Ligand binder design. Structure first.
Ligand SMILES: OC[C@H]1O[C@H](O[C@H]2O[C@H](CO)[C@@H](O)[C@H](O)[C@H]2O)[C@H](O)[C@@H](O)[C@@H]1O
Ligand SMILES: OC[C@H]1O[C@H](O[C@H]2O[C@H](CO)[C@@H](O)[C@H](O)[C@H]2O)[C@H](O)[C@@H](O)[C@@H]1O
Ligand SMILES: OC[C@H]1O[C@H](O[C@H]2O[C@H](CO)[C@@H](O)[C@H](O)[C@H]2O)[C@H](O)[C@@H](O)[C@@H]1O
Ligand SMILES: OC[C@H]1O[C@H](O[C@H]2O[C@H](CO)[C@@H](O)[C@H](O)[C@H]2O)[C@H](O)[C@@H](O)[C@@H]1O
Ligand SMILES: O=P(O)(O)OC[C@H](O)CO
Ligand SMILES: O=P(O)(O)OC[C@H](O)CO
Ligand SMILES: O=P(O)(O)OC[C@H](O)CO
Ligand SMILES: O=P(O)(O)OC[C@H](O)CO
Ligand code: NA
Ligand code: NA
Lengths: 330, 330, 330, 330
């Protein structure tokens, strides 16, 4: 098993922790955050979106005991002091949002970890990987990024469509759940003014991490795709609305068949496929990072189509963080 | 003064009523619905979205007294019995959703009205008129339709873009407020299964009335545009997300300049233009039916762009119902 | 195995169905509602509040196949035509809200069922039974009512407090999730004007079924308790806020000890007890019909206290419908 | 006119600013916060809850120009450096939540202001005042507190009830809108764990400032009243649910008459009175700090009653901050 330390116990850190409980290949052995262990235990035990933790959580001597296993709890501000080697950590899930460059994330390796996976898009040239788009390009790097949830939805779908029909150009929108960066009522957000406005009251235009990341994980599409977001008052699950022009003419049935074939074969567990009358809550807990909604999309003609794909922006991305941890450990 | 009877006191009927109070050329003299006058008064006085009625509302002898003026109240199921001539009604705002064909709406003329404006898309070939798209094609018809709110947002924007740059093809999404056809918790909706799912919990894919209507008010765009909707948990205000391929190359600044010129000139009061960091609640009460959001849109290249335009689906549409009543009465 | 037919596939009918899957003593063999089998299957499979159905759902020959078992589907408006004997139904879960009197519900017995459990308060003197209040008073009746969800929260708590300390008088509020009787935006509700106002926008004062029912299942408290509700914009889970004057002085720790003892002893699985920092979503899926929140309540003095108890108004009530079916079948 | 400086441009500071625009007796001449003037202008111009600012807002040379009047903008962390005398400030509205003791708030007087009104409950013995409860006790103090919104709702009602009928003991609940201290999704709130849980998803038990403040502004009720709160997913407007035992027997009609008499006389503009079928949005913008809801309350008997009173927790409190400023300046 791969021993993992989580740095940062926010939404991603906690859902990564829960996802790792259900996997035999990865074992969380340590968590670092500026939260007391008893408060960590509370945040783990109770979740408004995903329900009660499936297992036992004890606090003993400042550490967590989860399903009888001891999890080392620390509260280090400087990752260089984390002594990851003292708990045999192989890979660090870097989930604070604060260490998205090589120089900052490398402190985990100085502290004894072997590799680091950033749970967000890198801010320098640290390479990004998206399962179903470019895991096979990984080349042994000791620090990597799993991109972002929206990129994990867009890229697998864009790859199937491009590989089969040729994307000339495309624009996308994600209609995106409210997240922790937003405000409950109009409040200060000096670097993103719209993003300070009351989240439960508003449709809020925003920028998406996918516009900059998708051409990095699929270089053949660089400069051919961009987009934006609308944040809306739901607590989880988002949807990509991808408008593409195709080089090869394809009927909507042919598009469905290509997506379905990828979902049942090469991209199984990454790309999903449904023909049901689904809505966003039907993907709360979804592990696939891109679930194609066949009935929701619409074609104007054989070369211009709007495609719809769902993603649980918490669960899918967290599971693929673990997939990236496993992949770089092979 | 144009005397107007309102048939149906749902959301559109009540917001048309409020908007008519601010116009000197139109006076509401009668309302018909299966509601007691005291309940009509309550629904007019208090509005969760638009606040308290600006004026006085009294019930006297089974009728409404609004700002001191008597409004005749009736509860006729058959419009042929409405006796519109007894209150001097010129134009009926047909707002029940039940009489969207010539044969049904013409019962109002048999009942003494001179003209009818349907407050929804016609179900037969009753002509639709949308301000900023084709009011100038009106040619004396006594029964007309104002299309739908989404069509009133999309059509003025599509016209400016097509007239200046040529829309080869386009696909649109409206991210749309919850409406009265939706359900508070998962409930029966046998003709629209997704639409029965709990509105406050979900992003809900849906169809839009604008996909059929836009090519009818702008025949030059027939077959060139279609789209879909996502219903989201907000109570009012929606946004059109229009992705178009252009015949003539246009930079995003050139597109902005053209839209602003239309908003400040010919289409003033219909098309609006902003460069501010707006969110949906900033248009609660907006009278313009299409407010272009310059900063929210994004161009992939000089011939492929995503344009964003806001609309208060209650207020803008209701004001343009009144504009159409005035226009056909000239 | 008790064979059960469900009449009405609304929220209670569908959550009773799901809960029955986890019990070996009760098997659903038939469902009646004015829904096609494929639409019933969709409503069972996908739930915005409770997630995807845990099992397989297929439609075969107009009937449902659930976890491999055939469920007879019918669409009879008149319960006398339900032919319950043809599927060996023992007890009917009468969940339509339309047959809450002896004369109407007894049509199920004419149609071949042996007993009926109404899933709402009876409108005549059909006896109500609430687990943790008066199941032990059941004495062979073939038609009974399980009262309402709020009554199932209030009555077990009121009984423990009254039995130990003596309720002289009490007043309660339930802060209550939105339900299907409410409206998504301000709409017609001529028999309950406040209840027509947009559910997601408002705190809405309302009446509660528990104000009439509690004195019926606990006659010793008749005339000693009443209350009201506020409906709020959550999709499920509600909370009782009970303010009582006590005959016998009791400190808050003594009250806690008494409630905990009942939750751990006689009323285990009915009354729950927590000292954790819980919020409403922590009870989405809760089977206990009354979970006492020790830290939320507050005592003014040893004879005047405010007690707080949570309930999943869908899940707890539905499970106790099944408990009542089992109890009357003993 | 009284010249006022606002310290802190959060919800209270901004709604105080808007309220002062409509008053001739008070003129805002300066605002201090760590926000650029252009961002202050944006937060003032657009409000999700209260709509667009009624007036003009310009930014010039780092200062605000509002309806043509210059407002001095500063960004001082230490209030001792604010030079309030340079803009002739009489009274400071201390709205940061950070300076709720004599020693901290007195820095404004060192900086040249004459008096300070804290827009929250004091943390030391700085005296609190609530209009309709104890403004007439003000005795010239140069630093005062306006208590909190819930205390401004509870105290005027409790005073009428106690003065007329004698409160033996009472317990209250406020069902309270979401506020800026809450989180959009489950997040860190280490001093109030429940308060970190996702605000739009949950009913959240909480503590209320009124439990400690009400006996301070009405000493005759000290030790006779306390309570708690439930935070719910609405963006503004809250409601007090007051359960009281009365010394003097009073029918519910007698209680209504006493409240109505106070609302129309001595407490006019503080206590309001309605018999309408109201819901929370009907008080968005309400200036009265306590609006009694006659039809919502319920009496068990002539000495034990539940009373309901609404408050716009932003608008009412902000207007009474201005009232306190005017009162201490007499
Ligand atoms: O930080 C000062 C700027 O704030 C706004 O711009 C930010 O917020 C936008 C969303 O409202 C983002 O799109 C943008 O990227 C941010 O920089 C404001 O629009 C700018 O004019 C201010 O300079
Ligand atoms: O009415 C029976 C059909 O219901 C569904 O289809 C309706 O609902 C869809 C949204 O969920 C609409 O897109 C569609 O146009 C409606 O007809 C179901 O998907 C069908 O299989 C049923 O035949
Ligand atoms: O049906 C006519 C009456 O409607 C209102 O009263 C109903 O709605 C109230 C909630 O808004 C309930 O409390 C009440 O029990 C219902 O009867 C209205 O308040 C009445 O004046 C009307 O007669
Ligand atoms: O700060 C550590 C404590 O956190 C919790 O208590 C806080 O949060 C409660 C709401 O969840 C408040 O009622 C309480 O006043 C706060 O102190 C936790 O319940 C405590 O056990 C922790 O010591
Ligand atoms: O598309 P990639 O490069 O992530 O590869 C995914 C593999 O095919 C799955 O084993
Ligand atoms: O575009 P039309 O035909 O609605 O004409 C609009 C007029 O020029 C003024 O609104
Ligand atoms: O209180 P009752 O009468 O529902 O009896 C309950 C039993 O003792 C076990 O739940
Ligand atoms: O009740 P008080 O002391 O706030 O006094 C309010 C005055 O009567 C109003 O002028
Ligand atoms: Na329908
Ligand atoms: Na009703």
């Amino acid at each position: 098993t791969i021993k993992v330390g989580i740095n940062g116990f926010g939404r991603i850190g906690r859902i990564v922790f829960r996802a790792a409980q259900k996997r035999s290949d990865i074992e969380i052995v340590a968590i670092n955050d500026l939260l007391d262990a008893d408060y960590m235990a509370y945040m783990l035990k109770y979740d408004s979106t995903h329900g009660r933790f499936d297992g036992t959580v004890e606090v003993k001597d400042g550490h967590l005991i989860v399903n009888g296993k001891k999890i080392r709890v620390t509260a280090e501000r400087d990752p260089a002091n984390l002594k990851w080697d003292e708990v045999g950590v192989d890979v660090v899930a870097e989930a604070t949002g604060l260490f998205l460059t090589d120089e900052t994330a490398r402190k985990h390796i100085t502290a004894g970890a072997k590799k680091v996976v950033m749970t967000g898009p890198s801010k320098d040239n640290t390479p990004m990987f998206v399962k179903g788009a470019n895991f096979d390009k990984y080349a042994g790097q000791d620090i990597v990024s799993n991109a972002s949830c929206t990129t994990n939805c867009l890229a697998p779908l864009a790859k199937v469509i491009n590989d089969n029909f040729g994307i000339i150009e495309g624009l996308m929108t994600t209609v995106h759940a409210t997240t922790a960066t937003q405000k409950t009522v109009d409040g200060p957000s000096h670097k993103d003014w719209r993003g300070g406005r009351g989240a439960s009251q508003n449709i809020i235009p925003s920028s998406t991490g996918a516009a900059k990341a998708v051409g990095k994980v699929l270089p053949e599409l660089n400069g051919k795709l961009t987009g934006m977001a609308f944040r809306v008052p739901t607590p989880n699950v988002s949807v990509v609305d991808l408008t593409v022009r195709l080089e090869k003419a394809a009927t909507y049935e042919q598009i469905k068949a290509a997506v379905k074939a990828a979902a049942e074969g090469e991209m199984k567990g990454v790309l999903g496929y449904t023909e049901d009358d689904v809505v966003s809550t039907d993907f709360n807990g979804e592990v696939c990072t891109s679930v194609f909604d066949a009935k929701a999309g619409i074609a104007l003609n054989d070369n211009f189509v709007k495609l719809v794909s769902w993603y649980d922006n918490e669960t899918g991305y967290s599971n693929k963080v673990l997939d990236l941890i496993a992949h770089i450990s092979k």
